[PDB]
UniProtKB/Swiss-Prot annotation:
Cysteine disulfide links: 24-63
Organ and tissue specificity: Expressed specifically in primary and secondary lymphoid tissues like lymph node, spleen and tonsil. Specifically expressed in B-cells with a high level in normal germinal center B-cells, centroblasts and in a subset of diffuse large B-cell lymphomas. Highly expressed in bone marrow B-cells and weakly in earlier B lineage cells. Expressed in pre-germinal and germinal center B-cells in secondary lymphoid tissues. Also expressed in melanoma and melanocytes.
Keyword Cytoplasm recorded: yes
Subcellular localization(s) per the UniProt record: Cytoplasm
Domain Ig-like C2-type residue range list: 2-80
Protein name: Fc receptor-like A
Role of this protein: May be implicated in B-cell differentiation and lymphomagenesis.
Record's GO cellular component terms: cytoplasm; external side of plasma membrane
Assigned keywords, A-Z: Cytoplasm, Differentiation, Disulfide bond, Immunoglobulin domain, Repeat, Signal
Molecular function via GO: transmembrane signaling receptor activity
Segment of the intact protein contained: 169 to 262 of 359
Known partners and oligomeric status: Monomer or homodimer; disulfide-linked.
Length: 85
């Protein structure tokens, strides 16, 4: 059971104002981090939605897949988001 891959869809470079989703690709619960702080706490969903990309969304993100009691616990490599414009 390998480390999650964090993917940006459609890309890590959304145009400003456009929607994108972060996907934690891997019972596991998923959390998402930006620049050290949680942006979505543990949950069923392996997706972190950003429906309107703006400057504050640019940064270094990573995700975490883990069971409730942390018997299983793994994080992804970081992924930089660069909102364009």
């Amino acid at each position: 059971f390998p480390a999650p891959i964090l993917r940006a869809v459609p890309s890590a470079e959304p145009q400003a104002g456009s929607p994108m989703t972060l996907s934690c690709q891997t019972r596991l619960l998923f959390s998402f981090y930006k620049d050290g702080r949680i942006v979505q706490s543990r949950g069923l969903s392996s997706e972190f939605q950003i429906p309107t990309a703006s400057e504050d969304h640019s940064g270094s993100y990573w995700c975490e897949a883990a069971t409730e009691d942390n018997q299983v616990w793994k994080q992804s490599p970081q992924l930089e988001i660069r909102v364009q414009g």
